[PDB]
């Protein structure tokens, strides 16, 4: 039976060269003269811990790393960052979570979409992805379509083409 699945993919090598240029932005600029100013990726968790003295240093470095971030094709969707930061003594702090995989909240988003769209399609969940398998090619194009202008917050793509 036809299928594919949905995924959302955060390259790895493309994150770690967009912080490290972040950072080299950082220290090549005066007015982060002795300011703790760091962006940090914690590779496992796929998560850029941001650290400064003042909510506006933290928005500046924010701001540089979507920056960096976007020239290598990570686009400010995939980067999720809180409302609010960490305040703790002279310190402001802030973990902005790159968009890998589709969470359980965005996950139940997708499914409902798939079943109020009435075609002979079913979607499984799994792990961080999503296989959809149906007897019809046409449909699976018509739930790609549905997911891409679904406006659920961050890109998709669409892998594993079996039929």
Same mark, same amino acid.
């Given at each position: 039976?036809?299928?594919?699945?949905?995924?959302?993919?955060?390259?790895?090598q &493309? *994150?770690?060269?967009?912080?490290?240029? $972040?950072?080299?932005?950082?220290?090549?600029?005066?007015?982060?003269?002795? =300011?703790? *100013? !760091?962006? &940090? +990726?914690?590779?496992?968790?796929? !998560?850029?811990?941001?650290?400064?003295?003042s909510?506006?240093?933290?928005?500046? +470095? +924010?701001?540089?790393?979507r920056?960096?971030?976007?020239?290598?094709?990570? &686009?400010? $969707?995939?980067?999720d960052?809180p409302?609010?930061?960490?305040?703790?003594?002279? !310190?402001?702090? =802030?973990e902005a979570?790159l968009?890998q995989?589709?969470?359980? *909240? =965005?996950q139940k988003?997708? =499914?409902? +979409?798939?079943?109020?769209?009435?075609?002979?399609?079913q $979607? /499984?969940?799994?792990?961080e &992805?999503?296989?959809? !398998?149906?007897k019809?090619?046409?449909?699976? /194009?018509?739930?790609?379509?549905?997911?891409?202008g679904?406006?659920?917050? /961050?890109?998709? /793509?669409?892998?594993?083409?079996?039929?």
């Open positions: 039976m036809p299928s594919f699945d949905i995924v959302s993919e955060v390259d790895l &493309e *994150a770690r060269n967009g912080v490290d240029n $972040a950072v080299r932005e950082v220290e090549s600029r005066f007015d982060f003269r002795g =300011v703790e *100013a !760091t962006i &940090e +990726l914690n590779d496992a968790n796929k !998560t850029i811990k941001v650290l400064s003295e909510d506006f240093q933290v928005n500046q +470095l +924010l701001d540089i790393l920056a960096k971030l976007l020239k290598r094709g990570i &686009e400010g $969707a995939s980067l960052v409302d609010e930061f960490v305040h703790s003594g002279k !310190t402001w702090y =802030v979570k968009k995989g589709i969470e359980s *909240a =965005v988003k997708i =499914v409902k +979409l798939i079943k109020d769209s009435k075609l002979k399609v $979607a /499984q969940i799994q792990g &992805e999503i296989r959809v !398998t149906g019809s090619r046409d449909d699976l /194009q018509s739930v790609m379509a549905l997911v891409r679904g406006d659920l917050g /961050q890109p998709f /793509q669409f892998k594993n083409f079996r039929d």
